[PDB]
Design a protein around this nucleic acid. Sequence first.
RNA 1: GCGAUGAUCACCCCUUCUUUUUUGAAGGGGUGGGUACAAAUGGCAGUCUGACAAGU
Lengths: 102, 102, 68, 37, 177, 125, 238
Amino acid sequence: SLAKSPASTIQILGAEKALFRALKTKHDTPKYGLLYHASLVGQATGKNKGKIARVLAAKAAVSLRYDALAEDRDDSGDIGLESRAKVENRLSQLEGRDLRTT
Amino acid sequence: AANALEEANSIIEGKVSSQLEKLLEEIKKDKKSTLIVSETKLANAINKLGLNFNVVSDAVTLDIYRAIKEYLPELLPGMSDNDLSKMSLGLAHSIGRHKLKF
Amino acid sequence: EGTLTDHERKYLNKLIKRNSQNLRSWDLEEEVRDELEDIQQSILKDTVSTANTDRSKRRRFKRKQFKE
Amino acid sequence: RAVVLGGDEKKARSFIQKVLTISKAKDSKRKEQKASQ
Amino acid sequence: FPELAKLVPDNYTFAKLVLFIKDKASLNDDSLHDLAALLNEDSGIAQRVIDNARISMGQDISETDMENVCVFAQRVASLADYRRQLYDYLCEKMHTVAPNLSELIGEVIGARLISHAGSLTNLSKQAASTVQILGAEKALFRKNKGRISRYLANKCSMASRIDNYSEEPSNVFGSVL
Amino acid sequence: TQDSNYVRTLRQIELKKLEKGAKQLMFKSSGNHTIFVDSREKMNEFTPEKFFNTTSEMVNRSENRLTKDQLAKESLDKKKLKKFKQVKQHLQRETQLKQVQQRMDAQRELLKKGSKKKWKKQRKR
Amino acid sequence: GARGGAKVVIEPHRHAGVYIARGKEDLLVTKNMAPGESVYGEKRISVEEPPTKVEYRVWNPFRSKLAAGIMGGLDELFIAPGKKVLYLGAASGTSVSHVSDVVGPEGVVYAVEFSHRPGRELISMAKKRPNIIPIIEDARHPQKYRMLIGMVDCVFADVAQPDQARIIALNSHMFLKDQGGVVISIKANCIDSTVDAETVFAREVQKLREERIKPLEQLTLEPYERDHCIVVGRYMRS
RNA sequence: GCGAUGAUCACCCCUUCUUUUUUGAAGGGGUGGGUACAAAUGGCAGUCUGACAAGU
């Protein structure tokens, strides 16, 4: 049931009370949900937390769908590891960006 | 049940199990006896064993197997119909788990 | 054993009338069915849809036929 | 802004307007008498 | 092995037998006697569990899972033992603290009456009418039925005073009361 | 006065509410029924009463044709018309919300950054 | 509509093991073998009988083709309490569970299904129903699961395959009783989509006759389904 | 052989015949409510957007 969900839902999976309140009242919607307590999100700072949640949720669906729907999956997590590296690279270049002009 | 599943899988695959080897070898004393087998694959497998049995698997035999399966509980003293059904239920789940690669 | 005398085959016929009479109350009057059925087709046609499958059936029939 | 509301929320919204008109009527009547005196 | 849960409805007995029958595959005649010793064979569950275990639709779970079923069952088993110990402690403590009240109605019922009041001091201060409605929500004291409940409430009010305002209360007055 | 997110949520409520309401309803069968008979003389003597073993009134009722051997409210039905109409009213609301959302979708599409000759054929980098 | 707090009156159908809930709305209904839970989210109706609570489950004709058969006025349904049934094409417990309700504790249902993903769902439902015997195997080879199935009273098939009449014949010859039931759900498109549905149904009837199955009646499943019909026949070995 | 150490104080399941005659004869259960615990794949209840961003 989690594998059949788009990465957008996985991003805001645990914030339904805030989500539907915001949708019905013309207000900004949550951007972390239950993934807020993931280690990679904590490593991010400022608005980068919202961006990493979008990236990490997208990679979570890729790794999760492989876990659920793979017939001959190896119990190694190799798809998860390579997905993690992509997010770490995305965090590094996203963090290295400096908003203040030098 | 573990033995039953192994015996069940051999029947499905058309292979002769060791339990069936011993049972046939007991009757081997009877020279030139015809063996009626429900499935042709099992009939061919029994033939290769070199047992002195003329193995037959014909559409006409399906009537014999059909009558026996109707009156199987009465044919086998000591086992009631409920027991056979409840044995079938347990074995079925064990096979289904193996087929589904549980 | 089919030993019904005249009296049993009349008491039963009343029971048929009695039970059949009662079910009519559940079955309801004809007048509301006229409006109810009209609503049903409206609620059906959209939900089932299947306007398209009528078209696809006609298309598949048309394509195969030799054209001259 | 236009909105779509459930039955219970309509009843809640209907009730509060009824109260507010009664309060406005009771307050104005209270004002008029004290103005007269 | 879903079948066992139906066989032994008594949950405490169910846990103990689960500790013995960790794996339904293991079925020996000596083991049958050992589980036959568990509770009694009058219900016949000793023969049923062997018959059901040989043939059932239960799916075998991992060794780590089985480790938690037993370990979690040990936690349940210990709590039952401690609950019995704490119950016996309650009865002994009720006698020394409130011998008159415990004798009149009982240790458990009297202790609940004390808790609803908030303390034994509170209970002794209340009037008889308030004491009756203090236990009118769990039916502690329960037209002729109402008369006894009111009558017992008045005596319970008196017994609580002898307990509260005596340095070393006796049970002599609770007995006659 | 409303945004796209608000209208989308309302329609999604109605769609699920419509699905539940429809499942609650019953719809009378309109399928064709044919009986296979062995011989022409059996075909001619066939009548619905004998084949089904019925009275006439049960023959008309396909949904609960009780056998004869087995046989041996205006306010209430106004609620029925109310029930079927509510499911119809959820339908009318759902399509009315669909029309609004499409217009909001079109406006946002027109605001999108594109060639917009009608869209010219241009791959987006 | 027929909301949670709504009250209904339960009365019996012609078919044994099938019931209707009166009220405003008439709902096709079966008793729950495993009360307190729904297998696919269907509504349940509660009645207090001396007091023990017997539960009911709603049978949705739009989700089950057999239910659409009952709505259409099916004359004879061999599926009845205390009978063995072989359910071919048992994708999941959506309709088998309702069949399991009709047969009751005494009867059994042999649910045959091939694809693995719906198969695991079927096993999860079978655990709640002791009278369902699931078989994860291809119906094209009844010899494979011959051991698990005894002689059955009726054979119901929902397999949407072009060669379903062959599958029905092999299973019926090996497992169906003489004078037993055969109920076939036929989808015109799977067999032959270019021709009209009426022609397809006539062809399937001819095939069953060749396989010694006497057709008794036929019924289209409109409005619950399109280009579908249910054929009920009796198996004449003689 | 009493009592201030306390008496007393929701709903439903005339007719016929006759007369020594002003005379005689016959016709416990179900609802509802209150308190505490447990379960529901029962309800509210509907799962955000969608192609650019960053540097020279």
